[PDB]
Amino acid sequence: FPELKNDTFLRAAWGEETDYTPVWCMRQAGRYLPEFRETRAAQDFFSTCRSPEACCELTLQPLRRFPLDAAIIFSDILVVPQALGMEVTMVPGKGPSFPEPLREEQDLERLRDPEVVASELGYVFQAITLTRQRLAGRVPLIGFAGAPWTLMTYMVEGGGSSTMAQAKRWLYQRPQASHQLLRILTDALVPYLVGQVVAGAQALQLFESHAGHLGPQLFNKFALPYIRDVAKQVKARLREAGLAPVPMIIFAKDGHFALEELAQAGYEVVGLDWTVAPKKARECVGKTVTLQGNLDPCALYASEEEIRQLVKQMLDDFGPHRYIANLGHGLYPDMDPEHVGAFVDAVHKHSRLLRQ
Amino acid sequence: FPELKNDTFLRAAWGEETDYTPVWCMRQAGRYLPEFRETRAAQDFFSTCRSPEACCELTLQPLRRFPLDAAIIFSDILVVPQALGMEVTMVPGKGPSFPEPLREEQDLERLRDPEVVASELGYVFQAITLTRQRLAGRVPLIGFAGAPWTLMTYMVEGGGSSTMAQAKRWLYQRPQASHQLLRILTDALVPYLVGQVVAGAQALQLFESHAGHLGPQLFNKFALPYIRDVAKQVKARLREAGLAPVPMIIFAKDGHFALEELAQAGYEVVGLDWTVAPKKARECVGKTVTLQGNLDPCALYASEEEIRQLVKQMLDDFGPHRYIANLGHGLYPDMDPEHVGAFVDAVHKHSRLLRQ
């Protein structure tokens, strides 16, 4: 692969000093971009995901508009439960649906052996090698997947949910089947993430979006240990293959009560939502791990000058070391690309003016 | 009104010692009760709310099953935006909808003067006087309303929302119209809550369900000051009328980052969700205020013996003083009334065995 030219994002992730604060945005390839809607208008969502040229193109689009310090491959966390044998739809701009969710223990029998999952996900590895080639070393490429508990919520709920009532009902009423499913998910994730790195990914982010529904005790029993197992096994498999490990990011949306444990879970970087004050987050995580985040993405509805001021405040509270700027959640379809450009321009100009 | 016989809940709320930990459940009058579905099968939701006998009956039903230490009047937080002039529906078991949500500043013109709102809500005061009579002093009666920001989210979103994107867009793009609306809401709430106390309510709970969507800075600017204004004005109006103030509870769902401020906002009791460890909550709030909560209501899906153990742990972490037991969120329609009975029985037996 081409030699990496701008490794600021990787340096920050590892905890090293940098000349400026690197920045990227969750869903930087997303519907807020007209050209993203245009290229996606070509096929359906999961068929977009299976075309290496199409994922490559969607990954590069934001980089053409903005000097972001990283690319993240275009894909979906739901490719893993699909590759396990579940049928999925993106029903007419309504979001993800599993028409036949897991509802009882016997439903586990329909899933593939998790060791066959990576071979079902070859199309993502193809998209990753292609993108890493076409990026030609401009910035590092991030790979990703959903964390075990978060994927389990989709598989049992059949899509999004404001309560996760069914999924938490499994934890309380079927804790054994729950552990069995979480382990199937971990055992599928580890070889998929290792494959992403073999295909060319330079950093991995694990997305635990539905953590906040758990309190501390459920989260300690049912999410954290799988989260720890993912990073331990991925790093061990990469070493065994003779490959450099890459930095790993754990993003736990609404996960204020888990931050201290997450800082010990084997991840270089802890990604935060906008609900934790950056100074309190630093306190919970100590000064080993790098922090990523955490601007409310709705702030980008404010005027450019207001965005600049919000970025200045956020940067001042995180401080310059062991920090990667990002939003606290994905960009929304209605957001103005010019305001995304302002956020990116503001992080760069303020972090430098903060150094120089 | 009949002399109150069991005032344990009020004593705990004020911060006094008690012989046991009092307990009630959010949505204790709810669809998990077959007789609640039966009496509600009589008319539509908002017409149930307007019948004093029907609200009285729904309020008493759980008290017939369980020795709860308080009743809460049957009503809905959405009665206030309806009384301000907005049209609302409970469309066939789909939840609240406003078919015509507020979308721009000019939409404010359609709202009533907030000073006329209490006269539109006479039916709730009738339901409260009736219930306080029929309760005949068995336990105290709680009145309630939604907090200003939470009501504003319904009025702008038109119902529930996983992002509150439109409502936060108002905060970022129309901060002045936002403050105007929040003030209209506060100015309607204060006389409605005072009326509830004049009608016989012995305690008030303000429900800030949608707080967690805000980070600390938005919450400090747009929710907290209205929250403070509500309690200050209600207490001043009651004093001026010659009436005893009642204890006031602020419940801020997902509000971990606001707990320290909420403990200073003029409320006797801070109600918590299941996401904050009870020991950390105590730390944030000091040992002045009383804490209420915070059992994950999905725990009630567990077996009776497991519920007992979870209650024992929760009680041990809160400790006996300045504590009212409750769930961290309303009971779900599918919950087993026998498991609610276990939770109530467990709080009583463990808190006593903890004293004796």
UniProtKB/Swiss-Prot annotation, chains A, B:
Outcome after substituting residue 15 to E: In FPCT; insoluble protein
Keyword Lyase tagged: yes
Impact reported for residue 158 to R: In HEP; relative activity of 65% of wild-type towards uroporphyrinogen III
Origin: domain of life: Eukaryota
Effect of residue 134 to P: In FPCT; decrease of activity
Stated consequence of mutating residue 124 to Q: In FPCT and HEP; nearly normal activity; requires 2 nucleotide substitutions
Effect of residue 271 to E: In FPCT and HEP
Pfam annotation, one family: URO-D
Protein name as catalogued: Uroporphyrinogen decarboxylase
Gene name of the record: UROD
